[PDB]
Structures are given as C-alpha cells and as structure tokens.
Design a protein around this nucleic acid. Sequence first.
DNA 1: ATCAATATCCACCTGCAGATACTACCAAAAGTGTATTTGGAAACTGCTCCATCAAAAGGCATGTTCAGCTGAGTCAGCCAAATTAGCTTATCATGATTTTTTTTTTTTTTTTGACACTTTTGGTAGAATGTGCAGGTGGATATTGAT
DNA 2: ATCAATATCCACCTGCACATTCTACCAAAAGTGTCAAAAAAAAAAAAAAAATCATGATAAGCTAATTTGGCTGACTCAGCTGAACATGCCTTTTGATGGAGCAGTTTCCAAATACACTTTTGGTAGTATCTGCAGGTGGATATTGAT
Lengths: 79, 84, 98, 98, 106, 107, 93, 93
Amino acid sequence: DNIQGITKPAIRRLARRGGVKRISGLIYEETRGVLKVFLENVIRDAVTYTEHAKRKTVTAMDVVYALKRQGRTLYGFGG
Amino acid sequence: RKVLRDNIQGITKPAIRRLARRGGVKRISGLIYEETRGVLKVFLENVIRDAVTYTEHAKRKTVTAMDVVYALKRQGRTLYGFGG
Amino acid sequence: PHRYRPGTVALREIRRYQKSTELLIRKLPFQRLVREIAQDFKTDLRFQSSAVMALQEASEAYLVALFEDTNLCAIHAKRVTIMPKDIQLARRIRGERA
Amino acid sequence: PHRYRPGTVALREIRRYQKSTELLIRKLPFQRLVREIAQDFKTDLRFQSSAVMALQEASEAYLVALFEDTNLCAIHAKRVTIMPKDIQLARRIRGERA
Amino acid sequence: AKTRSSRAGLQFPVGRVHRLLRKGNYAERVGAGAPVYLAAVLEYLTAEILELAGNAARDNKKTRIIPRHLQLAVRNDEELNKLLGRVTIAQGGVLPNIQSVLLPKK
Amino acid sequence: AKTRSSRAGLQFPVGRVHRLLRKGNYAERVGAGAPVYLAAVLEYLTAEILELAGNAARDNKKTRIIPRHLQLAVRNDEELNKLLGRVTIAQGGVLPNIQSVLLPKKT
Amino acid sequence: RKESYAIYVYKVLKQVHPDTGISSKAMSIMNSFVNDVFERIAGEASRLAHYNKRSTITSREIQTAVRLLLPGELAKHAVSEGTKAVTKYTSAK
Amino acid sequence: RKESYAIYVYKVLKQVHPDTGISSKAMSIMNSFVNDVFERIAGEASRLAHYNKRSTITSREIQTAVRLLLPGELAKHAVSEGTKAVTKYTSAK
DNA sequence: ATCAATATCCACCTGCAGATACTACCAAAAGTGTATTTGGAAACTGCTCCATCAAAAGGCATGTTCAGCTGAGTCAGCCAAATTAGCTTATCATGATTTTTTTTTTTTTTTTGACACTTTTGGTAGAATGTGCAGGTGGATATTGAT
DNA sequence: ATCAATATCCACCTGCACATTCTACCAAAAGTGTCAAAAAAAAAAAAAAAATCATGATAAGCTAATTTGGCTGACTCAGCTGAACATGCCTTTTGATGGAGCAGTTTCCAAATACACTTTTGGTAGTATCTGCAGGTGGATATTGAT
C-alpha cells in the first residue's frame, strides 16, 4: 500500500469538483499514477530546498518555493 | 504612407496548409483556414504588444529584435537564434 | 421502494463539493505516501504540518483541474466517461508528456 | 489522365516539409500583417530588418506546433480531419483562450 | 509626523518598499519615485481585490471574508483570473459548472 | 601568466562568468568558488549538446552544424529536450514523425 | 521578528467595507497575493533596468513593468493610481 | 565590441568533434544557449541566498540550483564536472 | 500479376556565398598583490513543535448484486474538401539609394546613497471582550421515479 | 399527473472558538541634515540601418471543376457503472508527554570586496584565403493507381 491509501470512492470526490461525469475503472490507477508523479516532482525540488538549508525537516516554504519554480504557484502558506 | 489593412489575408490558404503538414496534419476542414489566421492574429498582437512596449520604454522608434525576443521570453515562448 | 437513476448522487455531490472547499483527502493515507516518497530522496525526514498541508492542497487542486481538462477531453469524443485515454491526451497537450 | 487517391498527396506532402526548416508563410504578406498590427499600437514604428523574422520563426513554429496538438485531438475522436471545434480544445486545455 | 507614505497619501508600507526593493537585489540604486508608484499599484490591487472579495460575503451571508470569498471573486473576474491564471488559492474549490450535456434530458 | 580557466582546467572564461555574475547583481557577493563551478556546468552542457549535435551532422552527411542539427539533437534526447522544452531553435524545423491512423492501411 | 503586509491590507480593507473583517486563512491568501505581485513587478522592473544598462530602477521602470504584467483594463487604472500616488508625493513637503 | 562565448563553444566544439563545422546560424543558437542557461542558474542561485538570508552566492548555491534546474542524468553529471573544476581550482596556485 | 507515368533520390560536377585564417591592438578585462572588512560558522542552548500514543465514535471504505446505460460494433448518403491544371498576380531576389534613427562622445544639472543622529513604528505576548461561525436540529420544500 | 421515496434551503440558535481591543515594549525601522559620489539629462555629431524604389521574373496563390473518401447520424447488443446497501476497518481528534530539531546568540576564521598596478585578451577591423553546401543534370529506384 501507501499509494492505494488514496481511496477509490474518494478520488471520485476530487473527480467530482472537476465536474467529472461518470467515471471509470482503469482511471483510478491511471490517476494514482499522475498524482504520484506530480508529487515526486514537487517533493524532490522541495526536499532539495530543505537540504540546501542544512535542515532535516521540510518547511511550508520548502514546498511553496518548489511549487513556484514548478509553475504551479500557491498563495496561503508563504507566511 | 499607404493605409495598411487586411493583411491577415496574406496568410494564404496555401501556406496556412503548408504549415499544417509539418504539424503532421492530413485532412483539413474548411472553417479551418480562417480560424487559423485569427489565432495567429491573436498571437502576434500579444507579442508585438510587448515588443512594442519594450521599445517605448527604450525611448525608441525602432522595434529591435532583442525587443521581440525579450517579448517571447516573457511569454513562455523563449526563442534562440537572434542575438540575446 | 425508491432508488436513483445513475446521475443524482453523482450530481448532488458535484453540486456539493463544487460548492465546498474542504479537502477531499484523509490527511494520512496521503501524508504517509508523502513520507514514503520523500524517503526516496532523504532519510528521517520531518514535515511541518504546514508543508504536508500545502502539497495536500496543491496536489488536490491540481488533480481537480486535470479532471476538468480531462472531462472535455472525453466530451470532446462525444461521451461522458472520463477514460484513461483522456488524461493521456490532456496531460500530453498540457506539456506533462512532451 | 492520372491522379492520386484521396490523401496520397498529403502523406506525401507532409513527409516533404517535415524534413525541411524553411519558413512557410511568405515573407512579404507576413511582414505587412506585422507592421499593420504594431501600427494600431504605436503609429510611426520602425522594424529592424531581423526582428520581424524573430517574429516569423516564432509565429511559425507556434502554428506548426498547434496542428500537432490538433490531430492528437481529432484523432482522439476517430476523425482525421482537423476542425475549429478541435483547435479550440487544444487551446482550452493548453490554457490559452482568454 | 510625515512619511513618504503620508505625503504620497498611501496606506501601504511605502517606506519598507524602498528597503525590499534593494534587499531583493532588484538592482543597486533605487530612484525615489518607484518605491512609491509601486506601493500605489500595490495598494490599488489589494483593495480592488478585497473589494470584489468583499461583495462575496454579501452573496454568501457571512460578513467576514474567507478564502472562498477571494477565490470566487478572482475567477469570476476577467482581468484578475488572467492575472492569477497560474496561481492556486488554497480552499478555493471550483465553479458551479456542468458542461450542459451532463445534465438530464439528453 | 595563467588564466583561471586553465587554473581550474576548464575553457569557458572563469572571470567572465564572475564579472557577469556581478553586472547582474544576482546577489551581493559572488564568492570565489561559484564562478568556477558555473563556467563548469556551462562547459559541460555545451560539450554535451555539440556532441549529439555533431553526430547529427555526421548522419546528415554534412561537416558543418546548422541549427537543424542542434534541434535534431536537442529534440532527440529525453533529457536535453526537457531542459529546452520551452525554447525554440530558430531555423530548426520539427521532428520527422507522423501519426499512425493517418497511415493508409488495411489491404 | 517577522514581517507582513497584513495591517496595510486591513487599513485598506478598512476603506472599502468598514463593516467587514477577514479570516486569518484569507489574510495570508492576501499576504501571498501582495508579496507575490511585488516580486513580479520588481524583477520585471529589475530586468527592464538591466536591459538598458541603466543602474537604477525608476518610476518609469515600475510603470513599463506594471503595463507589462497587469491585464488590459486592470492595467490602465493601475498605471493611474500609481501616477497619482506619485504626483501627490512630489508636491507635499 | 559585444561580448560572447563564440570561442569557448568552438574550443569545446573541436574537442568533441575535431574536424566538424559550425554555421553562423547555429553558433548563434548556441551563444543564446549558454546565456539562457547562465541566467537560469545564476538566478535560482541568487534566489537561494535570499531564501536563506545570505548575501553571498557560492559554489554551494550554484550547485543546489543546477540540481534544481537540470533534470536527471544531466544534472548528476554537471554537479560532478563542476565539483571537480572547483576542487582542482582550490588546489591550483 | 503486369505497366507506365510520377517522383523520390544516389552520386556527380561546379562557383560564389559563407566560414576560415592572418594580424594588428584596444580598451575593456582579468590576473596579481595588499590593505581592510565581515559574512556565516563553530559553538551554547533556549523555545518551537514534530513524532508517537492510546482513546473513542462511526464514517467513510469495501464487496456483491441489478438493471439501465451508453459506450462500442457497424453500415452507408450526403457532401465536405482532396486534387490536379489553367492563368496571372504579387513576391522576391538583385542592387542600390535615400533620409532618419540609434549610437558615440561629451558638459552640467540633478538625484541618491551613505554617515552618523532623532523618533516612529508595527510585532510580540499575554490577557481579554465581543461577534459570529459552526452544524445540527425542526421541516416543509424538493427532485425523480414508479404507478 | 399523482404519490411515495429519499434529500436541500430558511431559520432560530447558542456554545466555543476564535475574530478583535487593549497595554505596553522594543528591536528594527523610516526619516533627517549633511556630504560627496554618480547618474541621469542633455546635446551636438559619426555610423548603421531601415524604408523606398526599379526590375525583371515567377512559383505560388488563385480558382473551376471532378470525385474518392472521411464525416455523420442510426441501429443495438452488452460490457460497465451508478446505485443500493450492509459487515466493519482505521482515520479523526482529543489530549498528552517527550525529545528531536530549528531558532536566538556571541565570537572568530577565513573568505571577500576594495584599491594598486601589470599586462593578457578576446573583439573591431581591413584582408585575403579557403571550402562547402547550394543549384543544375543524368539519370536509378520505389511508389503508385489502373488493366
């Protein structure tokens, strides 16, 4: 597990907001795939931001600063 | 000194097609040939507008290429080959 | 007895969440994952509640939009079932696969 | 009198231009469309001989790279004929249209 | 009791901007007008934002203003939306939209 | 009489990489090790691309690189491509490809 | 010690709707809005500056930078207040 | 005079491909490349500092940047080719 | 299963644009040496807060069944738009010239930053008052699903 | 359309939580008067580059027409999903205690910025030298659509 922790009827909650009509079977995974890859990409850059600051913990900024350089900005935790 | 108008038509159906191959296209509809032009019109206006804007700040009358270039870079369409 | 033609508690959920902002993810199956992942980069990593809560946002909101973009992709094909094939497209046409 | 079946000029044609790197749009009609649009932004503007090509290479490349993002859409819906309803999507997913 | 902010009649930290502007290394030398003009554009937007963001509480009777207030505004405004088009507001949700075809009768 | 470039073993101008680092003022003090490391990455990346670039010229039986190659090389390399994925090579044309359904098949 | 635009956000909030507050989770969303914008207009102003060899950002830069960033009409008004804010600064002790 | 790396490219150019040629059209695309990369890195570097209240840019930043701006295999290689260059310098003269 | 007409093309030969070298030499540039500063690091540790429980409460997940569905197989008329030739315009590559815009250099008039000195402020930390948001409880209204 | 079958918005609310008021304190901050740097501001003047123009020359756009085939609306079984719902797992949330860790601080080392001085270089410039890739030509091969 740890990837499957992302519950099926829940993914549909997110699918909901997007105005997802019905849904599918093979989707849930295809999705589990994206989400994962999205993550790595951020976390990596972040984890790298964390490590530049001789830390062990990953701050809020640590992420922000990643999400920025990655194109997907995020207002709200910059404080 | 001659009134410029309707040059979005110089983008002839021929060429409008010539590109489309390189883009890997086979069958091309008909409403198409226009819809394209009027996209390119929007492209140019978004760039020129910035290019020209980097020209006015320079107290210039001459749209230089750096001008343009810096305008593509600023839009996400970074271009290599014209100095800069 | 009374059931529901496939649509209602699909819609009243749509209508629901689209009307809400709360997170649609249990703060752990996830956060664990989040931890799994990071390790693949560094050891004994700590995460300010603040951090994991961000990705959480980002990560979800992201999935959201991809879905919208996804949807059309399907509807584009005169259907209404978000098929795997869709994503592929959407995420390719975006840039995620080019 | 000989011809070439429906579509055996295209597949031919394509192959032709894909290995080339010369600008399609004619240089002249383009340049005018350029000075026309910069005109209605700033009257009396001069353009460096080059800076216009800067715009053509750019403008081109773009168009060429949206047809692509087009088939990948028409094709999505078993067709092989590019149409506005298509382009439009490609642009919407691409996050463009306004 | 006069500060550049005061004389320029401004409600934003017009003083710290001349600091932040150099600290960020966005140069060396900073003229004296810029630090101002900047603040202004800054003050303007902030309000223009909160504004549209405000009427949002008038729409969802609540008086105060929470994220969804801003988010609902921005998206519902052309300009802003464009400007924020690649920014994501935490606790924003989407917009009650259903590509027609997804509803009943066909 | 000995350049820093030869001091550190590279070729790209170390000092130039330094001076520019200032004239841009990306920070207050450009340390002493940085410019080196930089000119260093730049030398790598340049050699990395010219190589896949030449080879491209070798295939196309030419002995003079012309953008088409640079492009040909940059598009045909998973990595480099993503580095340049938002950059456009003037005069580079696209990659020789075609979709499949477009192909004329079935007897 | 930490900083923030928070107060000046309120002082201005306290200029459009004296009868209104702001959730803490909307303040930061307003801190990050501002904080962000600055960084934009600035660098764009910084570049403007370094594109001309000039060693100084001026009101001009900030403008040709504001015009470059903010959209159509949302851009014109912007240039406005700005100018004002400035033009009032000049004549005022 | 306009500065340019048309030589540091060329030198490197022969090294890999001794008897190969490089057009003007392409040497340009290349001068535009080194440069792009520079700014790109020289900027994330610049940034890290600020991100960590530092006034100096160092091989400590240029690295974290390369690891940030450069993808996989490429990166791991730059960091390397880099480190070396530094070390050998910190032992040159 | 052959056939001719079409066109892509393997190699060849050749001449001027384009790339390669020669070469002096300049001012900007980068190395070298020395006084002088200070950035941030090694070290000490206070105060934030991240991890790990165990409790409890039940909701949100999961696993099976059921029918209504629309996704996918399937065919076939109308008609969109491929394509192939019939003519003449607007582009272009030669080639240069006109005139105006940008770049080179130079004087002084204004603007800015830094230096050491006042004085102003907005966070910091409790403590604290007041306003309303959560959400939950009463319920007819509400949509839709089969009769 | 009627009616049971299962779920939403208005509403009265009031508990608890937190949005706001104050009270004071200062650690850093914003402005002041002054001084000397420098940058912008301007300004007559060489150098480069764009617009303007003639011209033969034309493949490239245009445009009519002929027509193979994709576009498109429809028939229809069935694989697929929502829906419907009931055994029950672990995610929340109170609530906590503990200890890793990041943050505040004081001093010194070594690293860096600044001026001194020397002189290495990479770039403009008149210069010619040199070579290849483009443009013509012959014709070999593979494609192609009808017989």
